[PDB]
Design a protein around this ligand. Structure first.
Ligand SMILES: COc1ccccc1C1CCN(C[C@H](O)Cn2nc(-c3ccc(C(F)(F)F)c(SCCN4CCCCC4)c3)c3c2CCNC3)CC1
Length: 219
Protein backbone atom coordinates (compact mmCIF):
# COMPACT_ATOMS: atom_id res chain seq x y z
CA UNK A 1 0.00 0.00 0.00
CA UNK A 2 2.73 2.54 0.96
CA UNK A 3 5.97 2.90 -1.04
CA UNK A 4 9.25 1.73 0.50
CA UNK A 5 10.76 5.16 -0.12
CA UNK A 6 9.53 8.65 -0.97
CA UNK A 7 11.43 11.86 -1.76
CA UNK A 8 9.24 14.85 -2.51
CA UNK A 9 12.34 16.74 -3.83
CA UNK A 10 12.28 14.46 -6.91
CA UNK A 11 8.59 15.45 -7.50
CA UNK A 12 9.54 19.18 -7.84
CA UNK A 13 7.71 19.94 -4.58
CA UNK A 14 10.67 21.23 -2.53
CA UNK A 15 12.36 24.61 -2.82
CA UNK A 16 16.05 25.18 -2.16
CA UNK A 17 17.29 24.97 1.40
CA UNK A 18 17.06 28.30 3.25
CA UNK A 19 19.24 29.80 5.98
CA UNK A 20 17.51 31.19 9.10
CA UNK A 21 20.76 32.62 10.51
CA UNK A 22 20.55 33.90 14.11
CA UNK A 23 16.74 34.35 13.99
CA UNK A 24 14.81 31.47 15.62
CA UNK A 25 12.28 31.18 12.78
CA UNK A 26 12.67 27.46 12.08
CA UNK A 27 8.91 27.24 12.75
CA UNK A 28 8.32 29.72 9.89
CA UNK A 29 10.62 27.90 7.49
CA UNK A 30 9.01 24.53 8.33
CA UNK A 31 5.53 25.99 7.75
CA UNK A 32 6.28 27.59 4.40
CA UNK A 33 8.17 24.42 3.34
CA UNK A 34 5.06 22.31 3.87
CA UNK A 35 2.81 24.83 2.11
CA UNK A 36 5.25 25.15 -0.80
CA UNK A 37 4.72 21.48 -1.59
CA UNK A 38 0.92 21.83 -1.54
CA UNK A 39 1.15 24.88 -3.82
CA UNK A 40 3.14 22.85 -6.38
CA UNK A 41 0.84 19.83 -6.03
CA UNK A 42 -2.21 21.98 -6.66
CA UNK A 43 -0.89 24.54 -9.21
CA UNK A 44 2.21 23.00 -10.81
CA UNK A 45 4.28 26.03 -9.69
CA UNK A 46 7.14 25.77 -7.18
CA UNK A 47 7.65 29.10 -5.41
CA UNK A 48 9.41 29.81 -2.12
CA UNK A 49 6.87 31.32 0.29
CA UNK A 50 7.69 34.18 2.65
CA UNK A 51 8.99 32.96 6.02
CA UNK A 52 9.47 36.64 6.92
CA UNK A 53 5.71 37.20 6.42
CA UNK A 54 5.10 34.63 9.18
CA UNK A 55 7.75 36.10 11.46
CA UNK A 56 6.26 39.63 11.22
CA UNK A 57 2.55 38.85 11.02
CA UNK A 58 1.86 35.49 12.74
CA UNK A 59 2.79 36.99 16.09
CA UNK A 60 1.33 37.11 19.63
CA UNK A 61 -2.31 36.44 18.55
CA UNK A 62 -0.99 33.09 17.30
CA UNK A 63 1.21 32.28 20.31
CA UNK A 64 4.30 33.01 18.20
CA UNK A 65 7.30 35.18 19.01
CA UNK A 66 9.04 35.72 15.67
CA UNK A 67 12.79 35.26 16.02
CA UNK A 68 12.22 33.82 19.54
CA UNK A 69 10.27 30.81 18.29
CA UNK A 70 6.82 29.77 17.23
CA UNK A 71 4.55 27.02 16.00
CA UNK A 72 3.91 25.70 12.51
CA UNK A 73 0.24 25.04 13.30
CA UNK A 74 -0.59 28.61 14.30
CA UNK A 75 1.51 29.80 11.36
CA UNK A 76 -0.93 27.85 9.17
CA UNK A 77 -3.86 29.33 11.07
CA UNK A 78 -2.49 32.82 10.31
CA UNK A 79 -2.29 32.01 6.57
CA UNK A 80 -5.90 30.72 6.76
CA UNK A 81 -7.11 33.80 8.66
CA UNK A 82 -5.13 36.20 6.50
CA UNK A 83 -6.40 34.55 3.28
CA UNK A 84 -2.83 34.46 1.94
CA UNK A 85 0.92 34.46 2.28
CA UNK A 86 3.35 36.45 0.14
CA UNK A 87 6.07 34.96 -2.03
CA UNK A 88 9.59 34.93 -0.58
CA UNK A 89 10.69 37.10 -3.55
CA UNK A 90 8.20 39.86 -2.71
CA UNK A 91 8.67 39.67 1.09
CA UNK A 92 12.30 38.59 1.60
CA UNK A 93 13.91 37.02 4.65
CA UNK A 94 15.74 39.51 6.88
CA UNK A 95 16.28 37.27 9.95
CA UNK A 96 14.80 39.97 12.19
CA UNK A 97 11.52 40.89 13.84
CA UNK A 98 9.77 43.51 11.72
CA UNK A 99 6.42 45.18 11.41
CA UNK A 100 3.89 43.17 9.43
CA UNK A 101 4.10 44.12 5.75
CA UNK A 102 1.78 41.54 4.19
CA UNK A 103 0.32 42.73 0.91
CA UNK A 104 -2.49 40.77 -0.76
CA UNK A 105 -1.19 42.04 -4.12
CA UNK A 106 1.82 39.64 -3.78
CA UNK A 107 -0.14 36.61 -2.41
CA UNK A 108 1.51 33.46 -3.83
CA UNK A 109 -0.32 30.83 -1.76
CA UNK A 110 -3.42 30.29 0.27
CA UNK A 111 -4.29 27.73 3.01
CA UNK A 112 -7.76 26.30 3.82
CA UNK A 113 -7.00 23.90 6.68
CA UNK A 114 -4.23 22.07 8.47
CA UNK A 115 -4.06 18.62 10.10
CA UNK A 116 -2.15 17.73 13.27
CA UNK A 117 -1.06 14.10 13.56
CA UNK A 118 -1.24 11.98 16.72
CA UNK A 119 1.76 12.22 19.07
CA UNK A 120 4.51 9.66 18.46
CA UNK A 121 2.73 7.79 15.66
CA UNK A 122 5.43 7.26 13.06
CA UNK A 123 3.14 4.97 11.04
CA UNK A 124 0.62 7.78 10.70
CA UNK A 125 3.41 10.22 9.76
CA UNK A 126 4.66 7.70 7.19
CA UNK A 127 1.17 7.52 5.69
CA UNK A 128 0.85 11.32 5.56
CA UNK A 129 4.27 11.78 3.96
CA UNK A 130 3.38 9.19 1.29
CA UNK A 131 -0.21 10.30 0.55
CA UNK A 132 -0.40 14.04 1.42
CA UNK A 133 3.11 15.45 1.02
CA UNK A 134 5.84 16.95 3.19
CA UNK A 135 4.91 17.21 6.88
CA UNK A 136 6.01 19.97 9.25
CA UNK A 137 7.50 18.53 12.42
CA UNK A 138 9.34 19.37 15.57
CA UNK A 139 12.59 17.76 16.67
CA UNK A 140 14.94 17.90 19.64
CA UNK A 141 18.00 19.49 18.01
CA UNK A 142 19.83 20.53 21.22
CA UNK A 143 22.66 18.03 20.88
CA UNK A 144 26.03 18.68 19.28
CA UNK A 145 25.66 15.44 17.31
CA UNK A 146 22.62 16.98 15.56
CA UNK A 147 24.17 20.28 14.45
CA UNK A 148 27.49 18.56 13.57
CA UNK A 149 25.71 15.79 11.57
CA UNK A 150 27.26 15.23 8.11
CA UNK A 151 25.79 12.05 6.52
CA UNK A 152 24.12 8.67 7.17
CA UNK A 153 21.20 8.02 9.52
CA UNK A 154 21.33 10.20 12.60
CA UNK A 155 20.77 8.34 15.84
CA UNK A 156 21.45 10.09 19.20
CA UNK A 157 20.96 7.95 22.38
CA UNK A 158 20.41 11.07 24.53
CA UNK A 159 17.75 12.54 22.14
CA UNK A 160 14.39 13.19 23.85
CA UNK A 161 10.87 13.43 22.48
CA UNK A 162 10.54 17.11 23.63
CA UNK A 163 10.82 19.16 20.48
CA UNK A 164 12.59 22.51 20.14
CA UNK A 165 13.44 23.04 16.42
CA UNK A 166 11.07 23.15 13.44
CA UNK A 167 11.95 21.11 10.33
CA UNK A 168 10.13 19.56 7.33
CA UNK A 169 9.90 15.86 6.52
CA UNK A 170 10.16 15.58 2.73
CA UNK A 171 10.37 11.83 2.61
CA UNK A 172 11.59 8.60 4.08
CA UNK A 173 13.55 5.51 3.22
CA UNK A 174 16.27 3.25 4.47
CA UNK A 175 20.04 3.21 4.18
CA UNK A 176 21.40 -0.34 4.58
CA UNK A 177 18.64 -1.50 6.92
CA UNK A 178 18.40 1.68 9.00
CA UNK A 179 15.07 3.35 8.33
CA UNK A 180 15.03 7.16 8.19
CA UNK A 181 13.00 10.33 7.86
CA UNK A 182 14.31 12.65 5.13
CA UNK A 183 14.41 16.05 6.75
CA UNK A 184 14.84 19.51 5.25
CA UNK A 185 16.42 21.95 7.71
CA UNK A 186 16.76 25.72 7.52
CA UNK A 187 20.46 25.93 8.48
CA UNK A 188 21.61 26.48 4.87
CA UNK A 189 23.48 24.08 2.58
CA UNK A 190 26.51 23.60 4.85
CA UNK A 191 24.38 21.79 7.43
CA UNK A 192 24.42 17.98 6.96
CA UNK A 193 23.87 16.62 3.45
CA UNK A 194 23.38 19.79 1.43
CA UNK A 195 20.99 21.08 4.14
CA UNK A 196 19.18 17.83 4.90
CA UNK A 197 19.43 15.22 7.61
CA UNK A 198 18.36 11.59 7.57
CA UNK A 199 16.93 10.91 11.03
CA UNK A 200 16.24 7.50 12.59
CA UNK A 201 12.73 6.27 11.81
CA UNK A 202 10.67 3.72 13.78
CA UNK A 203 13.01 3.87 16.74
CA UNK A 204 10.60 5.08 19.45
CA UNK A 205 9.73 8.54 18.13
CA UNK A 206 13.46 9.34 18.05
CA UNK A 207 14.20 13.07 18.75
CA UNK A 208 10.39 13.59 18.93
CA UNK A 209 10.16 13.60 15.13
CA UNK A 210 6.53 12.43 15.35
CA UNK A 211 5.68 14.34 18.56
CA UNK A 212 3.95 17.28 16.79
CA UNK A 213 3.55 16.77 13.04
CA UNK A 214 1.24 18.91 10.95
CA UNK A 215 0.54 19.68 7.26
CA UNK A 216 -1.54 22.33 5.45
CA UNK A 217 -3.87 21.84 2.52
CA UNK A 218 -5.06 24.17 -0.20
CA UNK A 219 -8.63 24.31 -1.51
C1 LIG B 1 -0.07 30.41 23.64
O1 LIG B 1 -0.72 29.49 22.73
C2 LIG B 1 -1.61 30.00 21.82
C3 LIG B 1 -2.18 31.27 21.92
C4 LIG B 1 -3.07 31.69 20.95
C5 LIG B 1 -3.39 30.88 19.88
C6 LIG B 1 -2.83 29.62 19.77
C7 LIG B 1 -1.93 29.14 20.71
C8 LIG B 1 -1.32 27.75 20.56
C9 LIG B 1 -1.85 26.76 21.60
C10 LIG B 1 -0.96 25.51 21.72
N1 LIG B 1 -0.16 25.26 20.49
C11 LIG B 1 0.54 23.95 20.34
C12 LIG B 1 0.44 22.94 21.49
O2 LIG B 1 1.13 23.40 22.66
C13 LIG B 1 1.13 21.65 21.10
N2 LIG B 1 2.58 21.74 21.18
N3 LIG B 1 3.28 22.15 20.08
C14 LIG B 1 4.57 22.12 20.48
C15 LIG B 1 5.65 22.50 19.51
C16 LIG B 1 5.56 22.16 18.17
C17 LIG B 1 6.56 22.50 17.28
C18 LIG B 1 7.70 23.18 17.70
C19 LIG B 1 8.78 23.54 16.71
F1 LIG B 1 10.05 23.22 17.21
F2 LIG B 1 8.65 22.89 15.54
F3 LIG B 1 8.81 24.89 16.42
C20 LIG B 1 7.81 23.53 19.07
S1 LIG B 1 9.27 24.42 19.69
C21 LIG B 1 8.67 25.47 21.04
C22 LIG B 1 7.97 26.67 20.45
N4 LIG B 1 7.78 27.81 21.38
C23 LIG B 1 9.07 28.29 21.94
C24 LIG B 1 9.06 29.75 22.34
C25 LIG B 1 7.71 30.19 22.76
C26 LIG B 1 6.70 30.03 21.63
C27 LIG B 1 7.10 28.92 20.70
C28 LIG B 1 6.79 23.18 19.96
C29 LIG B 1 4.68 21.70 21.84
C30 LIG B 1 3.40 21.47 22.24
C31 LIG B 1 3.00 21.00 23.59
C32 LIG B 1 4.20 20.59 24.41
N5 LIG B 1 5.40 21.41 24.20
C33 LIG B 1 5.82 21.47 22.80
C34 LIG B 1 0.77 26.38 20.24
C35 LIG B 1 0.19 27.75 20.60
Amino acid sequence: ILPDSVDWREKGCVTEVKYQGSCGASWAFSAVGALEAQLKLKTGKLVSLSAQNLVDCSTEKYGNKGCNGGFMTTAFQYIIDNKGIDSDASYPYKAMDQKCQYDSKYRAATCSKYTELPYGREDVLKEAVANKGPVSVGVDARHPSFFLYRSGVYYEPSCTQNVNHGVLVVGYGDLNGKEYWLVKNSWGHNFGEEGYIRMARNKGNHCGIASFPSYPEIL
